Amino acid sequence: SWIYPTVILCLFGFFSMMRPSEPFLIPYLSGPDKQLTSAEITNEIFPVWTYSYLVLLLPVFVLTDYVRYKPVIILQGISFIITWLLLLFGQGVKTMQVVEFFYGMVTAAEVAYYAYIYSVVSPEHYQRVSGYCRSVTLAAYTAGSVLAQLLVSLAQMSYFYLNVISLASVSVAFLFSLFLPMPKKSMFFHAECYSSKRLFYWSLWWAFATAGFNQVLNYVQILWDYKAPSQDSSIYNGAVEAIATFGGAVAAFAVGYVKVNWDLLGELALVVFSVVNAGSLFLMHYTANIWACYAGYLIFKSSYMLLITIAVFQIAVNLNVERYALVFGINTFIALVIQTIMTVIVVDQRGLNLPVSIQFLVYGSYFAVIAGIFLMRSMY
């Protein structure tokens, strides 16, 4: 009774998340196919993702529950096809900004993928089935990244013929999405807690830490292309993106394996590993070597996933399943307001229009000021 909706939803999650072209994006955008200057990608186009995701977050969250979760999963599958049709044939800077907007829909509509299962499976088969659907997303993007490198290296496949595989993959994803059973109840429509000392405190580090994480991962392929232009030397983006994704998975798994009370060791473990994020972000900035810049990416992604797991674990210790949605929905919206303010001032063309060379001296220092504030907050 639970195996059909999960098999169809896991197949959609696997095929929609398998996109070999993702690691080779800036190499593709700033190439002979859609030759676009680095300053045009970082300061004009990319900011449009956080602006559009911010606006299309509350409406889609309320829409996902009003109409059932299935209608919005089909919408995400369409936005996948539109994004990769423009990413293949669309030309110019203004078309790439539309691609940024449509990817904000793709990222804003994934709420219905994980929220769908709760309304179609029994409560007991929820944590197990929620794990199956989350792990198939990691296996798909870690296998897809490995496929990208194994072709670009041992087969000399053009970046253009990696978006064709990405388009073919998400086109199949929007074939199972039409076959999922339609839910017969939502969480809120058809179905004060922040006062706790822990929940508000733990939500602030989550909201602030994740906002910087999204900012760092945003302009990271631009940094790699700056330290080693893709048209001059070999670039191992696919192998690096796969190992970093795999490394982050083990960091999250290890957090739940060791049984250590996250109250006498909960705040300290978030300052020690937040310092590691800052230390790993200055290395990516101050090093002329591309291998040391790859290693800094591994440590940043692995280290961050080791705390978002601890922050999430502590947040969700007394809340119901119904209160996860509207507590993790606010935190994801606060993190976007933080990200938008940082993007407007730092990266946006109308703001400071800082290049990617100096940007990581800001992101690295951003994580160093969160550690001090959460270490200087212990005042006596």
């Epitope: 859609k34 030759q35 676009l36 200057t37 300053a39 045009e40 423009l86 044939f89 669309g90 030309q91 110019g92 800077v93 203004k94 078309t95 539309v98």
Partner: nanobody
Framework: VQLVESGGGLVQPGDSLRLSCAAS????????MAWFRQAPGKEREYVAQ????????YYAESVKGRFTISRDNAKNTVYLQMISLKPEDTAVYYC????????????????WGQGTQVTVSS
């Protein structure tokens, strides 16, 4: 837009050359212009790029440091000043405008110029 070039010719080594590009006809929607190069028995080669609304420039590594691309919106012309020429530069230099809008196409550059001849030799 109808891009017509000027300023080509034969110049010894060490002499300069300024090339113009008078865009006209639908000049209202231009957001980037570039210069390309096609040496004899070769393919088109990127040489430079200038943004219209702003002024941000972008040069090919080989030609950087002696090529300078500037806009003159007032008259809608685009220039390319080339210094310290050597006999390995001789080519046909083309304009390329990326006019604007949401478009599907194979090249970022919609319209192209006729070409201007640079014959560096002695």
């Amino acid at each position: 837009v109808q891009l017509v070039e000027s300023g080509g010719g034969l110049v010894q080594p060490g002499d300069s050359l300024r090339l113009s590009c008078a865009a006209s006809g639908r000049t209202f929607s231009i957001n980037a212009m570039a210069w390309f190069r096609q040496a004899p028995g070769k393919e088109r080669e990127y040489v430079a790029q200038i943004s219209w609304t702003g002024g941000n420039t972008y040069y090919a590594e080989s030609v950087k440091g002696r090529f300078t691309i500037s806009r003159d919106n007032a008259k809608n012309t685009v220039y390319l000043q080339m210094i310290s020429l050597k006999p390995e530069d001789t080519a046909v230099y083309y304009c390329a405008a990326d006019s604007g809008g949401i478009r599907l196409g194979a090249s970022r550059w919609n319209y192209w110029g006729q070409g201007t001849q640079v014959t560096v030799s002695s």
